Amino acid sequence: GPGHMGSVSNAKAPTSALRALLEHKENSSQNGPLAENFATFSGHAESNALRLNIYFPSSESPSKPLFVELRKNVLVSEAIGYILLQYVNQQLVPPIEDEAQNPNYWNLRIVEDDGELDEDFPALDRVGPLSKFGFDAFALVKATPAQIKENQAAYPFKSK
Numbered sequence: 217g218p219g220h221m222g223s224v225s226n227a228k229a230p231t232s233a234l235r236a237l238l239e240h241k242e243n244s245s246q247n248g249p250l251a252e253n254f255a256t257f258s259g260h261a262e263s264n265a266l267r268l269n270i271y272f273p274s275s276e277s278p279s280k281p282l283f284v285e286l287r288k289n290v291l292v293s294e295a296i297g298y299i300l301l302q303y304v305n306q307q308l309v310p311p312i313e314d315e316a317q318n319p320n321y322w323n324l325r326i327v328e329d330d331g332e333l334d335e336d337f338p339a340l341d342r343v344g345p346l347s348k349f350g351f352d353a354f355a356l357v358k359a360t361p362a363q364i365k366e367n368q369a370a371y372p373f374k375s376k
Contacts, residue, residue, distance in 0.1 A: 251301055257294040259287035266346060268295050269353040271331050275310045278331075281353075286346055293319050293342035295354070320368055325357035333357075343371045 219225070247255050259265035265285035271278050284298045296317055303312065315321050323339040326349065339357055340346065359367070 248301060254294065254297050254301065257287055257290040258285050258298065259290070260285065262287055264288060266350070267352040268346065270299075270355065271327060271353070272310070272356045273333065274356070274358075277308075277310065280306065280308065288347040290346070291342045292324060292340050292344055292346045292354075295346055296322075296324065320364055320373060321359070323357045323359040323363065323367065324354045326351055327353060327355045331355075341367060341371075343367070 247260075251258075262285075265287055268282070268284055268286055270282035282299060282302050284295065284302075286294055286298075296319065299312070300317060302308075313321070319341040324341060325339045326334050326337045328334060331353075333355060338344070339359075340349065340354070
């Protein structure tokens with residue numbers, strides 16, 4: 217014959233040559249335990265995730281901004297929530313309160329390309345989607361009970 221008698225000829229060598237496919241130790245993963253809840257909104261698998269930068273004015277080291285990838289549908293609240301992961305990784309010395317992670321305690325204000333504080337614009341939060349303005353940079357602005365009360369008024373706080 218012009219070739220092999222058998223039809224559709226091909227090489228014999230299945231990928232699963234090994235009996236087991238590299239068994240994992242115990243549900244091991246690159247994602248951190250805390251990251252499980254947060255990384256869910258990070259859009260790690262989403263290449264269309266919005267980038268975000270931070271610049272705290274109260275901090276003495278503003279040269280260290282927070283870089284994270286967030287989905288186009290997740291709210292701002294997730295932006296700060298990631299701060300916990302970076303804090304450990306960068307071991308930032310500046311002391312940050314645990315309750316300050318929530319937007320209810322502090323507010324996030326937009327800044328110019330020069331990092332200047334814009335008082336003319338509102339402070340985005342859980343009620344203000346990050347992708348709404350399409351900005352990849354923000355700053356932490358101090359909020360008092362008066363402002364906090366108003367912020368939670370629009371978005372009622374759910375009980376733990």
